[PDB]
Structure formats: C-alpha cells, structure tokens
Amino acid sequence: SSLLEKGLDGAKKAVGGLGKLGKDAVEDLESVGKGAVHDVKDVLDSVL
Amino acid sequence: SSLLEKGLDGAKKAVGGLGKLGKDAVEDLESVGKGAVHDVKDVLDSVL
Amino acid sequence: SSLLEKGLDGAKKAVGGLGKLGKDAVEDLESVGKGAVHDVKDVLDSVL
Amino acid sequence: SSLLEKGLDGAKKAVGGLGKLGKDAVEDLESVGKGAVHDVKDVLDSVL
Amino acid sequence: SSLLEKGLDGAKKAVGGLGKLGKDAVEDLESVGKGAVHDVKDVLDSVL
Amino acid sequence: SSLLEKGLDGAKKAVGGLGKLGKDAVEDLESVGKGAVHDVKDVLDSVL
Ligand SMILES: [Zn+2]
Ligand SMILES: [Zn+2]
Ligand SMILES: [Zn+2]
Ligand SMILES: [Zn+2]
Ligand SMILES: [Zn+2]
Ligand SMILES: [Zn+2]
Ligand SMILES: [Zn+2]
Ligand SMILES: [Zn+2]
Ligand SMILES: [Zn+2]
Ligand SMILES: [Zn+2]
Ligand SMILES: [Zn+2]
Ligand SMILES: [Zn+2]
C-alpha cells in the first residue's frame, strides 16, 4: 500500500489530535474562568 | 441592584464569550488543516 | 484538475460552514435564555 | 421551598433542553448534507 | 454501484450514530449531576 | 467560609470533570471507528 496516502493520513490524524488538544485547552480555560467567578461570588455571599 | 454581582456577571459573560471565540478558532483550524490534506489527496488522485 | 470534485467540495465546505453558523446560533440562544433566567434570579435575590 | 426559584429552574431546564434539541438538529443536518455529497462522489467514482 | 463501499458507509454511518448517541448520554449525565448539585444548594439556601 | 457549599462545589467540579473525561472517550471512539473504516477503504482502493 502507498506510503503517500499513508503520509497524508499521518498529517490528517495529527491535525485532528491537535484540534482535540486545542478544544480541551479552551474548555479548560472556560471552566477555570467561570469557576473563579463562582468562587468569588461565594466570598461575597458569606459576607454580603 | 448590586454593582458587584453585576460586575462578576460582566466577567462571567466575557469569559464565556472568549471560550466561544476560542472554540470557533480551534474548529476553524481543524477544518483548515483537514481541508488542506483533502485538497492534497485530490491532486494525487487525478495524477496517481 | 476536475471541476466536478471541486464543485462537490464547494458544496461540502458550504454545508460545514452552515453547520458552524447554525451551531453558533443555537449556543448563542442557549446562553441568552440561561442568562435571562440568571439575571431574573438576581432581582429575586436582592428582594427576596 | 420556594415555588419561584422552582419556576426559574423550570425555565432554565427547558432552555437547556431546547439547546440540546437544537444542537442535535444542526448536527443531524450537517451530517445529512456531507453524507449526500459523499454519496454523490461515490457515483462519480464508479463512473469517472 | 459497489456493495463494498456501500457496506463501509453502512459501518461509518453506524459509527457516527453511536458517537451521537454516546455524546447525548454523556451530556445528559453531566446535566443530571450538576442539576442535582444545584437543587441541593437550593435546599441549603432556603434553610442556611 | 462554609464547608458545605465548598463540598457541593467539590461535587460539581467532579461531575464536570467526569463529563469532560466522558466526552473525550466518546469522541476518541468515534474517530477510532471512522478511522478504521477509512483505512479499510484504502486497502480496497489500492486493490479494487
Ligand atoms: Zn484538561
Ligand atoms: Zn460555590
Ligand atoms: Zn470562523
Ligand atoms: Zn476533493
Ligand atoms: Zn454569536
Ligand atoms: Zn448575577
Ligand atoms: Zn437526530
Ligand atoms: Zn462511500
Ligand atoms: Zn437525552
Ligand atoms: Zn434553583
Ligand atoms: Zn483521548
Ligand atoms: Zn487513507
């Protein structure tokens, strides 16, 4: 079987993997930010 | 109503918006990369 | 290279773009609705 | 417990459910469109 | 047209459908869990 | 600050984390399945 299409599949899979890794990072930051805001609200609930 | 929780909502919404903007960017790149690989396969279909 | 597969790629990309545009719209409405409910809860926190 | 926050939760959950239903619809159409393009490519593979 | 690629498309579509069904299940559980935590917070708001 | 809401946040975050872990698993399997079908198509391209 062809090394050539095998190589483009290597590229394709790597691209997908990076998209996976990227999407995980963004969602992580989203939750990190909204979690910080929530934890802040908590301190201003037990005080005001 | 309180400026304070209003401000944390400002932060929360901004965080969500950035997560939206971020997720759009990643998905765009994913498709850009897999599209390039596909278009390359096309040239190596009409030739080999 | 073939206009034909080039055209089907035109269709494919347009379909993907619409799916992108569509998914953005739904998520926007989701957040719009849940944001309204949250802002309502806020008024019934500073009052009751 | 309060009927009021219970009601806003009713609204919130309904909004989420609609977002779910909506996202499912968009993704379905995405795949329907890209599937049609693929099946078309198949006929123009076994012929040209 | 070929039964063979027709069959692999059968497999592909079934795989996608399972991924759809799976993603729906996970998101459902996510919301079920976070909804339970929210409803619990409600009881400890009207009491403490 | 209250151990109680701190604990429910522990639960909430754990639930979200599981949803993350779950969604990653489903998407992984989706791609594993569609990748296998693609690699099979490749062998039936270089032969038939
Ligand atoms: Zn992570
Ligand atoms: Zn909290
Ligand atoms: Zn874009
Ligand atoms: Zn093409
Ligand atoms: Zn938007
Ligand atoms: Zn608020
Ligand atoms: Zn469906
Ligand atoms: Zn096919
Ligand atoms: Zn469901
Ligand atoms: Zn509630
Ligand atoms: Zn993984
Ligand atoms: Zn291949």
Side-chain angles (χ1 to χ4, degrees), chain A residues 4-20:
Chain A
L4 255 172
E5 224 272 14
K6 173 160 291 183
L8 306 183
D9 288 348
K12 207 169 230 182
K13 297 193 175 174
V15 174
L18 291 187
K20 173 180 167 185

Side-chain angles (χ1 to χ4, degrees), chain D residues 5 9 13 20 23-24 27-28 38-39 42, chain E residues 5 9 13 20 23-24 27-28 38-39 42:
Chain D
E5 224 272 14
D9 288 348
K13 297 193 175 174
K20 173 180 167 185
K23 270 153 81 174
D24 187 276
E27 266 242 315
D28 281 1
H38 173 72
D39 296 338
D42 288 333
Chain E
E5 224 272 14
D9 288 348
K13 297 193 175 174
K20 173 180 167 185
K23 270 153 81 174
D24 187 276
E27 266 242 315
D28 281 1
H38 173 72
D39 296 338
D42 288 333

Side-chain angles (χ1 to χ4, degrees), chain B residues 9 20 24 28 38 42, chain C residues 5 9 20 24 28 38 42:
Chain B
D9 288 348
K20 173 180 167 185
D24 187 276
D28 281 1
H38 173 72
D42 288 333
Chain C
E5 224 272 14
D9 288 348
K20 173 180 167 185
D24 187 276
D28 281 1
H38 173 72
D42 288 333

Side-chain angles (χ1 to χ4, degrees), chain B residues 1-2 5 9 12-13 20 23-24 27-28 35 38-39 42 46, chain C residues 1-2 5 9 12-13 20 23-24 27-28 35 38-39 42 46:
Chain B
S1 84
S2 163
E5 224 272 14
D9 288 348
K12 207 169 230 182
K13 297 193 175 174
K20 173 180 167 185
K23 270 153 81 174
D24 187 276
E27 266 242 315
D28 281 1
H38 173 72
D39 296 338
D42 288 333
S46 66
Chain C
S1 84
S2 163
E5 224 272 14
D9 288 348
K12 207 169 230 182
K13 297 193 175 174
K20 173 180 167 185
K23 270 153 81 174
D24 187 276
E27 266 242 315
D28 281 1
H38 173 72
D39 296 338
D42 288 333
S46 66

